[PDB]
Structure to design on (87 residues):
């Protein structure tokens, strides 16, 4: 059920993630890059810092359908962004 998301230098893989509304979804965030990265969905108030070579789970339960910007706060300007779709 878990959705794996690779964080690397400097991209998300996958960069478009779809998750169900009013339900709980677990994301496994794996930072395989040399740099620290974040998994940030500001409109959902989500922000997780994942250290280089490490991994973290987050469980999300969105209440509003929509498409929300995903960024890394550290390497945004290298084009490190994506989308999370709640439907």
């Amino acid at each position: 059920k878990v959705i794996e998301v690779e964080l690397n230098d400097d991209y998300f893989n996958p960069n478009v993630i779809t998750i169900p509304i009013n339900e709980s979804t677990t994301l496994l965030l794996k930072n395989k890059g040399k740099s620290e990265h974040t998994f940030t969905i500001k409109k959902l108030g989500i922000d997780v810092v994942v250290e280089s070579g490490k991994e973290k789970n987050i469980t999300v339960k969105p209440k509003s359908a929509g498409t929300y910007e995903l960024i890394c706060r550290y390497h945004l300007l290298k084009g490190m962004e994506g989308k999370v779709i709640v439907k």
Q: What stands out?
A: The chain is about 0% helix and 55% strand.
